């Protein structure tokens, strides 16, 4: 029983949407109505800094 040759897949994969959104998370940018993409780990620091409400 030799090592199986797993059939090389085709069609679109999850990676295109995943790295598109990974670009969309960092690296600033614009959209339809939002004023600027504040990046994750900068927007993350801002959302802890202005805080979530507690109780």
């Amino acid at each position: 029983p030799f090592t199986p040759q797993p059939a090389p897949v085709t069609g679109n994969t999850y990676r295109t949407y995943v790295n598109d959104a990974r670009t969309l998370l960092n690296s600033y940018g614009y959209t339809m109505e939002g004023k600027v993409h504040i990046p994750i780990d900068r927007a993350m620091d801002l959302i802890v800094e202005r805080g979530l409400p507690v109780r």
Partner: protein, 54 residues
């Protein structure tokens, strides 16, 4: 030559050699079977009742 034929020397040397080789081969059989991909079920795609695809 009184009991045995002319190639008795040939057959006896070949028989002692063959006994050594079948001992070596049986050890090889046992070792190969205990490490075989059949025995440990290695690189065998064992069928699941749904055929999930990872």
């Amino acid at each position: 030559a009184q009991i045995f034929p002319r190639n008795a020397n040939l057959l006896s040397r070949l028989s002692i050699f063959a006994l050594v080789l079948l001992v070596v081969e049986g050890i090889l059989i046992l070792g190969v079977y205990f490490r075989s991909n059949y025995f440990r079920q290695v690189n065998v795609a064992i069928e699941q009742p749904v055929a999930f695809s990872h």
